[PDB]
Design a protein around this ligand. Structure first.
Ligand SMILES: NC(=O)c1ccc[n+]([C@@H]2O[C@H](COP(=O)([O-])OP(=O)(O)OC[C@H]3O[C@@H](n4cnc5c(N)ncnc54)[C@H](OP(=O)(O)O)[C@@H]3O)[C@@H](O)[C@H]2O)c1
Ligand SMILES: O=C(O)COc1cc(F)ccc1C(=S)NCc1ccc(Br)cc1F
Ligand SMILES: [Br-]
Length: 310
């Protein structure tokens, strides 16, 4: 159930995603998740619901359903806080909202820094994101200070490409390696190259959008649908599991961590029942064969930023 990180701590390979979980639903979703066995929650300041996630975590700690040591709580530094003097405050606001005194893991959410201010996506008058001149290496140094102040147990990265991971690994005076790179990964975007690179460096990969993010706000009717793919359905049927359960077990068997999102109690529970079956090697290779380099998480307004990863 857990994978060992290069900071010496163990991380549950299944967690609960919280992007798009409505603030009026996510407290119950996290309560239900902890009650049915989840011990890892994936959060972010930009999701605008950390307060409500925190109410759930705190209630389950108060009720003594779980111990703090048994939970693995992850959050992420938003792009408008990649300045030396803003990183600690950004982390502290997340801690405050989550009702925590430390994070198990804190990630640079995207490699690109944006102009600080109230807006999460500051734009120029023609719709391009406004960058910050801060680079990935100085942001990493700021992350390392959070470990040394006790605010976070591990630090990592998200949406970093091969060359950006390499830039951190080659950083002069590197003090802590990234523990995790959290990236989009599913049968339509299998990520074999970047996963093999990160794993070879001892960086654990977390697969986001493992179900293809059907609730992403920019979904279009014509788009591919993992959950409705009859080939994946057939694998599920053969194992008497749901398609979602196959899509969650797939990254687990690649030695990835996976963070499916749901606010539906029945689905939260279903999605956890993935430790009692095995996909065959042939099943695994067949799922890998569906790769189409189809990315659900990309954003035109940020594509000219110097550090846009894709
Ligand atoms: N690091 C980053 O840049 C980044 C980017 C994207 C995502 N993430 C993280 O990864 C998490 C997962 O990705 P995601 O939210 O994009 O999408 P996802 O987990 O691939 O899909 C979530 C969607 O699947 C539905 N669903 C869940 N379980 C289901 C089941 N058993 N059967 C049928 N439908 C099911 C959910 O519906 P209901 O909720 O209505 O049940 C929701 O609409 C996020 O929430 C976030 O924590 C990180
Ligand atoms: O980002 C998430 O976790 C999930 O997605 C989001 C979640 C939010 F709460 C707000 C925006 C996003 C978007 S639009 N993310 C895409 C995106 C952002 C920044 C850069 Br650089 C590139 C890029 F592709
Ligand atoms: Br970016």
């Amino acid at each position: 159930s857990r994978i060992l990180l290069n900071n010496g701590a163990k991380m549950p390979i299944l967690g609960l995603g919280t992007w798009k979980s409505p603030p009026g639903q996510v407290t119950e979703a996290v309560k239900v998740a902890i009650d049915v066995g989840y011990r890892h929650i994936d959060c972010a300041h930009v999701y605008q619901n950390e307060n409500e996630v925190g109410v759930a975590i705190q209630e389950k700690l108060r009720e003594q359903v779980v111990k703090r040591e048994e939970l693995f709580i992850v959050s992420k530094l938003w792009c408008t806080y990649h300045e030396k003097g803003l990183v600690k405050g950004a982390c502290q606001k997340t801690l405050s909202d989550l009702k925590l005194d430390y994070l198990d893991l804190y990630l640079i959410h995207w490699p690109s820094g944006f102009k600080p201010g109230k807006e999460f996506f500051p734009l120029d008058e023609s719709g391009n994101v406004v960058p910050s001149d801060t680079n990935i290496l100085d942001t990493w140094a700021a992350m390392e200070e959070l470990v040394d102040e006790g605010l976070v147990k591990a630090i990592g990265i998200s949406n970093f490409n091969h060359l950006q991971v390499e830039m951190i690994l080659n950083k002069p005076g590197l003090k802590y390696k990234p523990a995790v790179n959290q990236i989009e990964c599913h049968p339509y975007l299998t990520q074999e190259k970047l996963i093999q690179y990160c794993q070879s460096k001892g960086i654990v990969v977390t697969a986001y959008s493992p179900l293809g993010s059907p609730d992403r706000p920019w979904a279009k009717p014509e788009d591919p649908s993992l959950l409705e793919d009859p080939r994946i359905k057939a694998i599920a049927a053969k194992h008497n599991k749901t398609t979602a359960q196959v899509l969650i077990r797939f990254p687990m068997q690649r030695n990835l961590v996976v963070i499916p999102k749901s606010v539906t109690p029945e689905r939260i529970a279903e999605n956890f029942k993935v430790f009692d079956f095995e996909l065959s090697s042939q099943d695994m290779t067949t799922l890998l064969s569906y790769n189409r380099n189809w990315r659900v998480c990309a954003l035109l307004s940020c594509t000219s930023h110097k550090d846009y990863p894709f």
